[PDB]
From a paper:
In purple bacterial photosynthesis, light energy absorbed by light-harvesting 2 ([name]) complex is transferred via the LH1 complex to the reaction center complex, where it is trapped by the primary charge separation reactions. All such complexes are formed by the circular oligomerization of dimer building blocks consisting of pairs of low–molecular weight, hydrophobic apoproteins to which bacteriochlorophyll (BChl) and carotenoid (Car) molecules are noncovalently bound. We report the 2.4 Ångström resolution structure of the light-harvesting 2 ([name]) complex from Marichromatium (Mch.) purpuratum determined by cryogenic electron microscopy. The structure contains a heptameric ring that is unique among all known [name] structures, explaining the unusual spectroscopic properties of this bacterial antenna complex.
Briefly, 17,338 electron cryomicrograph movies were collected, and 3.05 million particles were picked for data processing. Figure 1 (A to C) shows three views of the cryo-EM map of the Mch. purpuratum [name] complex at 2.4 Å resolution, which is a previously unidentified, circular [name] structure formed of seven α/β apoprotein heterodimer subunits. The complete α-apoprotein can be traced in the structure apart from the N- and C-terminal amino acids, and the β-apoprotein can be fully traced apart from the first four N-terminal amino acids. Both apoproteins have a single membrane-spanning α helix, with their N termini on the cytoplasmic side of the complex and their C termini on the periplasmic side. Each α/β heterodimer binds, noncovalently, three molecules of BChl a and two molecules of the carotenoid, okenone. Two of the BChl a molecules form a strongly interacting dimer with their Mg2+ atoms liganded by two His residues, α-His49 and β-His38. The structure of the [name] complex from Mch. purpuratum described here is the first direct observation of these two populations of different carotenoids, which serve structurally and spectroscopically distinct BChl a molecules, and it accounts for the spectroscopic properties of these pigments, which have lain unexplained for more than 24 years. The 3.6 Å distance is consistent with the rapid (<200 fs) energy transfer from Car1 to the nearest B828 pigment, and Car2 is precisely positioned, with a distance of 3.2 Å, to transfer its excitation energy to B800.
Numbering used by the authors:
A (entry chain L), C (entry chain J), E (entry chain H), H (entry chain F), J (entry chain N), L (entry chain D), ...: 5 to 48
B (entry chain I), D (entry chain G), F (entry chain K), G (entry chain E), I (entry chain M), K (entry chain C), ...: 2 to 70
Write the structure that this text describes.
């Protein structure tokens, strides 16, 4: 009903699918690099 | 609550904890609040620099302790 | 009556519900992490 | 109050403590005042860096004192 | 008469009421914290 | 999940992990999200400065080790 | 005053102390002047960092002097 | 004649009156604080 | 490629190396990409500060070596 | 269907061609300079 | 003056000291020139930090000299 | 012919007159202060 | 020149030294290019800080040499 | 065909002429100052 962003609910849900893809890709790659860094040196 | 305010003229009463939500009649959150989140991120970074500089916090003295890989 | 933000009073109240949710979530998580940090080291 | 001002021409009298509220006829608070709050946040951070650097304030010398957990 | 901010004089006065509330709240809380800090340590 | 929130009034239930996607009804990603990516870049730079300052990480002590060219 | 200016062509005379107010025909103060005030705030912070670093000014050497509480 | 700022000449002159007030107030207060600082310590 | 994603619901498949170009349906490059180039410039400056601080790189120890003029 | 960027799908694909050109040019030149720097000094 | 320029094609001649004023057909000074003045302010601050750091300039060694009050 | 800045050629030339005034004033004052600084101390 | 590009599809040929000028069909210089000049100013300041820190350049060791006034 | 910058191809080419002039002037002056700096001190 005239959302503040100017996006419809359908647009918002589709975008959120793409955003979740980006977030999870970033999280998984960061987790891999963290495991590798910890193997190299634990930092605690 | 209505606190005493330094040359208020009393046509509009404030009573604010109840009259929050009214800031959003001035601040449009579609244009702000990502900038405000950036402010919060800057605050986060500064308080972290400070805390990590305090003795014992963070990892400046603990890089190799135990359970290594 | 043509609010400065361009939001109606109803929009403002609904948004404030969401904003209070965000604020309180942030406050509670920060409080938990503070309790844990204090247990680890009190800083005074 | 009307203070003397360096080549004012006196058609418009100022009298300002009373004629505040008139700045908001130039500054639209819907577009500003989140930026002004960001300025206030920067001021807050700078005065805090300064004060915390002064001897005795903050937690640089008090990390472990008493009542621990 | 078509003010530069796009606010009417009435809007400007109402906003200034709210702004004075904010300013004075900030001033009073800062004054309290200053008194407490001075009691703890005067800094001059 | 529905967490308890400090003076919520319960007409609008939150239940948020499911009601994400709804932030994008306030935040237009065509105007934001490059700014948010800039925030993420700043975070990246700051965490890297910190980590590279920690002993053993980065290349401050390893510039000439072996297998040279 | 009319100062000599390096390849002015003299159709428009300047005479400026009188012809201030004319900058506001280019600079709209509703969009600027909060940014200009931010510039002034930055100037304020920088001159204060400098002055407080000078010996005797500020509170770096006076934290506990007298009249304590 | 359609000024670049969108202000008329009359608007520009009125604003300049207000701006000169601000400038001179700032200058005079700064001068007072400078005199006080110099009395405290001349810095040259 | 289609990677597994943490509470995706599978009406829209991603397959992204092929479905790049689609970011430009959200990010208008006429308004961004000079800001993104500024981000890249900041990255360039930071990685250069770091690399030039590493021993042997840059010109901190080589200002007068040979072939002078 | 009224994309959020205001670009059509065809505009988006054409731009992406140009963007990939830029990205790959930058990557290849950086790779060359890295090889040269490593030859000069390996940094690990 | 017309300087030789690296793959100019000569339909449009430049001759620029005369063809300044033409930059203002691209740069609207109502939207810029307060930002440009901010750039000039940053330049001013940086050159001042540098000059004040040079021996003899500024007030780092002259805080109490003579004619006190 | 619909210039990119939205200024006409006449507006551009008039503005450039004002801009040259500003530039030259700044240059001349800076030159004076430089001469004074050099007299005080040459810096090379 | 046409360089090989990593998953280009060849409907649009690039040939770019000739097909510059085409960036200005995406980047509007009336809105950019003062920001780009600000980027260039930042680059200028950073390279100057670096160069002035190198031994022999600038005026850190030459403040009083000769021909004084 | 409704370019993303809002410039026509002719506007883009004319602007690029001006931009190339600026770029080359900057490059040539920088090269001169570099030659002078190298003569003064080579930095490698
Ligand atoms: C180094 C020795 C002294 C010192 C010497 C000086 C000197 C010397 C000066 C100041 C001035 C100022 N000092 Mg100091 N000061 C010191 C320590 C402090 C401390 C502190 C935590 O200890 C504080 C809070 C301050 C605070 C301040 C500011 C109130 C003021 C600059 C404001 C300004 O220019 O706004 C610029 C205006 C703006 C950014 C826009 C408007 C913003 C708001 C509205 C400003 C409100 C207050 C202001 C006074 C109002 C001016 C009227 C105009 C109509 C806006 N000083 C030390 C101890 N201080 C300077 C000054 O200008 O006083 C006027 C000044 O000349
Ligand atoms: C290192 C030895 C000297 C020193 C050496 C120099 C030298 C050398 C120079 C200056 C110049 C300046 N110095 Mg210094 N200066 C020192 C210490 C100080 C101290 C201080 C707290 O001690 C202050 C307040 C200043 C202040 C200033 C500025 C007024 C001025 C730069 C303004 C400018 O470029 O605006 C740029 C313009 C803008 C950002 C836009 C307009 C902003 C407003 C309107 C400016 C108003 C004032 C200005 C003079 C007006 C110019 C006219 C134009 C029409 C705008 N100096 C030390 C002690 N100073 C420089 C200068 O340019 O003087 C003109 C200069 O050449
Ligand atoms: C380290 C040894 C030397 C040194 C070595 C060098 C070297 C090496 C170089 C410079 C260059 C520059 N030096 Mg230095 N320089 C030193 C000390 C100084 C001092 C000082 C206070 O002592 C000053 C004021 C300067 C000033 C300058 C600038 C004028 C110039 C960079 C401008 C630029 O790139 O704009 C970039 C353009 C913009 C940001 C946009 C336009 C802005 C305005 C219009 C620029 C006007 C002036 C400019 C020359 C015009 C170029 C033409 C174009 C059509 C815009 N140098 C020390 C002593 N200097 C560099 C240069 O590029 O010269 C051209 C350069 O190569
Ligand atoms: C600093 O450290 C110290 C100080 C030293 C130490 C302290 C320290 O470390 C701290 C405090 C750290 C704090 C960190 C925090 C809070 C991090 C928060 C991170 C978040 C929220 C990340 C979100 C990422 C989100 C991401 C990647 C999303 C990406 C989305 C993408 C690409 C979508 C594209 C797409 C692609 C195609 C199509 C067709 C479409 C439509 C889209 C949209
Ligand atoms: C620096 O330290 C030093 C200097 C070293 C030491 C000093 C120091 O430390 C200092 C001085 C610290 C000062 C700190 C201060 C003042 C902090 C102020 C904090 C505030 C005001 C926080 C507000 C948070 C607010 C929050 C999280 C709000 C979140 C809202 C959210 C997510 C809503 C989404 C949503 C979701 C879904 C839907 C559908 C909708 C519509 C919305 C809106
Ligand atoms: C850095 O330190 C050094 C360098 C180390 C040392 C030097 C140093 O320290 C210096 C120099 C310090 C200088 C400090 C200065 C100049 C400070 C100036 C402060 C000002 C002007 C504050 C204004 C605050 C104004 C405030 C809070 C206003 C708040 C308003 C609010 C919330 C209205 C909401 C609302 C709510 C509901 C509704 C319905 C509506 C409509 C509204 C509007
Ligand atoms: C950094 O230091 C170093 C680096 C260590 C040392 C070097 C250093 O120090 C240097 C170089 C310093 C250089 C300083 C310079 C150049 C300063 C220039 C200052 C200027 C131009 C100030 C202008 C102020 C202008 C002011 C306050 C104007 C205020 C106007 C106001 C409130 C109007 C409201 C209103 C109110 C009511 C109504 C109804 C209306 C309509 C209006 C408009
Ligand atoms: C900091 O370091 C530390 C902290 C010390 C150490 C840590 C450190 O190092 C780190 C963490 C580094 C992280 C780095 C990362 C994440 C880098 C990400 C880089 C990316 C995404 C680059 C994208 C480039 C993209 C590029 C060049 C694209 C260029 C496109 C161009 C020109 C198109 C024009 C055109 C031309 C003609 C025409 C006709 C058209 C239409 C167009 C569009
Ligand atoms: C940092 O230093 C190091 C790093 C330590 C050392 C290195 C260093 O130092 C370096 C590299 C320095 C480089 C410096 C450079 C490149 C400087 C370039 C300066 C320029 C381009 C200045 C232009 C000024 C232009 C000016 C003032 C123009 C003012 C115009 C004005 C007021 C018009 C009003 C008006 C008034 C009335 C009316 C009615 C109208 C219509 C108008 C428009
Ligand atoms: C930092 O250093 C370290 C970190 C210490 C060391 C590392 C370091 O150094 C590094 C990494 C440096 C990297 C540097 C790089 C990448 C530089 C890239 C530079 C570029 C792209 C410059 C472009 C300039 C472009 C220019 C001047 C263009 C000017 C155009 C002008 C005036 C047109 C006007 C006009 C005039 C009249 C009319 C009528 C019209 C229409 C126009 C348009
Ligand atoms: C917009 O949202 C964002 C910014 C985007 C983010 C979200 C956000 O804003 C959030 C989360 C906000 C949280 C806000 C809070 C927690 C606000 C808390 C406010 C409080 C606690 C105010 C207290 C005021 C007290 C007064 C005023 C006392 C006066 C006392 C005297 C004694 C007054 C004296 C006095 C009075 C009159 C005269 C005449 C005189 C002479 C005197 C002495
Ligand atoms: C928008 O997107 C961007 C920004 C552009 C980027 C993407 C982005 O946003 C991403 C990736 C986001 C990830 C978000 C996550 C991971 C969010 C996670 C949120 C969580 C975990 C919230 C938890 C809340 C818990 C509560 C609230 C507990 C309360 C407990 C008590 C005990 C409350 C007590 C209490 C309650 C009421 C009263 C009255 C009283 C007195 C008390 C004490
Ligand atoms: C827009 O353009 C700009 C920004 C303006 C500039 C240009 C730009 O963007 C450029 C140049 C971009 C280059 C981008 C690249 C190079 C992007 C590369 C992306 C990659 C490599 C993604 C990889 C993702 C991997 C995943 C997701 C793996 C998951 C694995 C598990 C095991 C997942 C586990 C899991 C899953 C689900 C559940 C439920 C659970 C429990 C688990 C554990």
């Amino acid at each position: 009903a005239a959302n503040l962003s100017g996006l419809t609910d359908a647009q918002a849900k589709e975008f959120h699918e793409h955003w979740k893809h980006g977030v999870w890709s970033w999280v998984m790659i960061a987790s891999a690099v963290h495991v590798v860094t910890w193997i190299y040196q634990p930092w605690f | 609550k209505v606190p005493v305010m330094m040359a208020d003229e009393s046509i509009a009463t404030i009573n604010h904890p109840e009259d929050d939500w009214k800031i959003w009649t001035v601040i449009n959150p579609a244009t702000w609040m990502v900038p405000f989140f950036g402010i919060l991120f800057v605050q986060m970074w500064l308080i972290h620099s400070y805390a990590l500089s305090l003795p014992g916090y963070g990892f400046k003295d603990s890089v190799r302790v135990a359970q290594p890989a």
